[PDB]
Each structure stands twice: as structure tokens, then as C-alpha cells.
Amino acid sequence: PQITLWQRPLVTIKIGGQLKEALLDTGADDTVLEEMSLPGRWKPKMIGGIGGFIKVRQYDQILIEICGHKAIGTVLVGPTPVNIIGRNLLTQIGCTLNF
Amino acid sequence: PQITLWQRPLVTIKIGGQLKEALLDTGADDTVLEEMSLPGRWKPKMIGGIGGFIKVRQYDQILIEICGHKAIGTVLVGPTPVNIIGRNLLTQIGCTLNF
Ligand SMILES: *[C]C1(*)(*)([C](*)*)S[C]([C](C(=O)[N][C]C2=[C][C]=[C][C]=[C]2)N(*)[C@](*)(=O(*)*)[C@@](*)(*)C2(*)(*)(*)(*)=[C@](*)(*)C(*)=[C]C(*)=[C@@]2(*)*)[N@@](*)(*)[C@@]1(*)C(*)(*)(*)(*)(=O(*)*)N(*)(*)(*)C(*)(*)(*)(*)([C@@](*)(*)C1=C(*)[C@@](*)(*)=[C@@](*)(*)[C]=C1*)C(*)(*)(*)(*)([O])[C@@](*)(*)C(*)(*)(*)(*)(*)(=O*)[N@](*)(*)C(*)(*)(*)C1(*)(*)=[N@@](*)(*)C2(*)(*)(*)=C(*)(*)(*)([N@@]1(*)*)C(*)(*)(*)(*)=[C@](*)(*)C(*)=C2*
């Protein structure tokens, strides 16, 4: 698809059975989901942004589906205000920025 | 141009006869620049990010050129880790997300 930025670029993801809304975000290096339960072991991590840093759990090799496209990679889970798809999975579905 | 997201989408902007680097960020509603001096009067604004809220200054009608495309609009100044080009100016240069 081609997406305009007059509104926020929100999409439906499928994440282990659940459907969610998420933000396609080129300014995020990583994908960060709101607090949820994932299968697997994890590592703590700190990520920072506007307003400072938060602690997240790092999960590896999670399959996500972003508009039909499935992608695999690292997912961070934590007290983010919104679900965010970052550059790590955007690349996997062939996302580019165009003008 | 078409930008891929394997690296950060950093570009050069020009504001006030200075060149600076900035991130193209579709996850940002507005444009936020590191601490600097702009023309005119400002008003107060609060923005929320990953880590919390910050208080910024809002200057209206600023000209930026981004990659040789010039835009005029609202820019916020405050303590951001990087200069950020958000959706208000990304729409003015015709930027879309594609996959
Ligand atoms: C996405 C987000 C987080 S969300 C926010 C927004 C919304 O929607 N909401 C909330 C609010 C409310 C009220 C008020 C305000 C807010 N908003 C917006 O958009 C506003 C703004 C503008 C500009 C800026 C900011 C804000 N928010 C958002 C954000 O924050 N985003 C971001 C930006 C940035 C970039 C860079 C730096 C800083 C910031 C993005 O997009 C994402 C992020 O966060 N990034 C950073 C990072 N992250 C991560 C990293 N880094 C690494 C790793 C992982 C993750």
C-alpha cells in the first residue's frame, strides 16, 4: 500500500492470535508493544525517547503480522502509550519512505 | 527520493542558513528541534513521548528546507535527543510510506 501522513499511520497487526492497532513509526529503531504476555524467555532493556527512559522486556524472534505481511524479529514489551512498529520490522515488509 | 529503513532516516535540513541533521519520523505528529533560537514570539506546548511529557516552545510559520524541499510551518523547540521532522512538515514535502 501507499500511505499518506495526513493522519497517523496506524495499522492492524496480528500478534499471536490477537489483533491490535499499531503505529508505523520510522523514528523508532525498535518495535515496542503495550504490556502483554508473550511466550518465551526475555531480557530487560532500557529505551529512551522524548521524556526519558522506560524499562522494557526484550523478546526475540517473534512473528508479527503487519497488514497481511508476516515478519519476524525482536519485540519489546512495556509501558508504552501506544503500540509501535519500528524499523526492525518495517524493513522486513519492504517499507520505504517516499518523496 | 526513496528512503529505506535499514538505517535511520536522517536527512539534512536547513534552517536559518544553518545546516542540521534531522530524523524523518512518521510516528511524530509535530516537528521538534533541539534547543535553538528562532524568530518571533513563542507559545507553550506540552508533548508526550515514550518516556513522559515535556514542555516545549511553539514557533509558528518557520521555514525549513528539507532535502531541498522547502516547507513553512510550526516548529517546536525543546529537549529532544535528536531533531525530528514530524507529520506536519512531512505532508508538506509530499512524503508517503510505501510497502
Ligand atoms: C509514538 C509516540 C510515543 S505517541 C506520542 C504522540 C501521541 O499520539 N500521543 C501522546 C501525546 C498526548 C498528548 C500530547 C502529546 C503526546 N504524540 C506526538 O506525536 C507528539 C510528539 C511530537 C514530536 C515528538 C514527540 C511527540 N508521541 C510519540 C513519540 O514520542 N514519537 C517518537 C518521537 C521521537 C523520536 C526520536 C527521539 C525522541 C522522540 C518516535 O516516533 C518513537 C520514539 O519513541 N522514538 C525514539 C526511540 N524509541 C525507541 C528508540 N528510540 C530506541 C529503541 C526502542 C524504541
From Swiss-Prot, chains A, B:
Domain of life: Viruses
Residues annotated as the enzyme's active site: 25 (for protease activity)
Residue segments, region Dimerization of protease: 1-5, 49-55, 88-99
Segments forming domain Peptidase A2: 20-89
The protein's assembly and partners: Homodimer, whose active site consists of two apposed aspartic acid residues.
Record's function text: Aspartyl protease that mediates proteolytic cleavages of Gag and Gag-Pol polyproteins during or shortly after the release of the virion from the plasma membrane. Cleavages take place as an ordered, step-wise cascade to yield mature proteins. This process is called maturation. Displays maximal activity during the budding process just prior to particle release from the cell. Also cleaves Nef and Vif, probably concomitantly with viral structural proteins on maturation of virus particles. Hydrolyzes host EIF4GI and PABP1 in order to shut off the capped cellular mRNA translation.
Protein name: Protease
Organism: Human immunodeficiency virus type 1 group M subtype B (isolate BH10)
Lineage: Viruses, Riboviria, Pararnavirae, Artverviricota, Revtraviricetes
